[PDB]
Design a protein around this ligand. Structure first.
Ligand code: OFU
Ligand code: GDP
Ligand code: MG
Length: 168
């Protein structure tokens, strides 16, 4: 049977979670997507020759620590933690997202990739070295992406699938 992988995209508002998800789903850059829409989207993709079914949860909206929201995020098997390379605050937020994922998954070994998005822009404020070093601190991959140009998009999502497989 076709394996389904439940992937969850997290990070500060405005970093490009929806744009990255849409690039994977539609193969199109969408510069405008209602910031409040949290939804999940499926697509069949061939990864290392194996057709699998990706179920992407593009998170959005208000920070809330109800049991219900915890259970919704706990359905994720792997997480993309996204910041934007021209937004220092979004990078400084990453550790909070990482903390909450560890808590809801009750594991210090959750499949996860650090994603530095908007790599097409010249306004960089987060050094690549600092991001690489944070991924090194957490023992996870770091992928540079652009939802605008498609840079790194498959690398980010497909790496997460490979991490889930290894974890299994
Ligand atoms: C960085 C923060 O801001 C926001 C803003 C929006 N969301 C968050 C946020 N943190 O974790 C999560 C997720 C979705 C991540 C996956 C696991 C779980 S489990 C659960 N219940 C979640 C929730 N809500 C989450 N989202 N944080 C700063 C710093 C603290 C105050 N705050 C202003
Ligand atoms: N240049 C550029 N803009 C991007 C990129 N990804 C998203 N954006 C823009 O960043 C803003 C927020 O994107 P959105 O997908 O709504 O982010 P979300 O709140 O994390 O879902 C919008 O103005 C998008 O056009 C990217 O890789 N490059
Ligand atoms: Mg969005």
């Amino acid at each position: 049977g076709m394996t389904e992988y439940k992937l969850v995209v997290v990070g500060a508002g405005g970093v490009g979670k929806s744009a990255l998800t849409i690039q994977l789903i539609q193969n199109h850059f969408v510069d405008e997507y209602d910031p409040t829409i949290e939804d999940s989207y499926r697509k069949q993709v061939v990864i290392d020759g194996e057709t699998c079914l990706l179920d992407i949860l593009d998170t959005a909206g208000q920070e809330e620590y109800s049991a219900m929201r915890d259970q919704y995020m706990r359905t994720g098997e792997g997480f993309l933690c996204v910041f934007a390379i021209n937004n220092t605050k979004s990078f400084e937020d990453i550790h909070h997202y990482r903390e909450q994922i560890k808590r809801v998954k009750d594991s210090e070994d959750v499949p996860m990739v650090l994603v530095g998005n908007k790599s097409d822009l010249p306004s960089r404020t987060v050094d690549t070295k600092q991001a690489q070093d944070l991924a090194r601190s957490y023992g996870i991959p770091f992928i540079e992406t652009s939802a605008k140009t498609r840079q790194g998009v498959d690398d980010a999502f497909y790496t997460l699938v490979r991490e889930i497989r290894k974890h299994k």
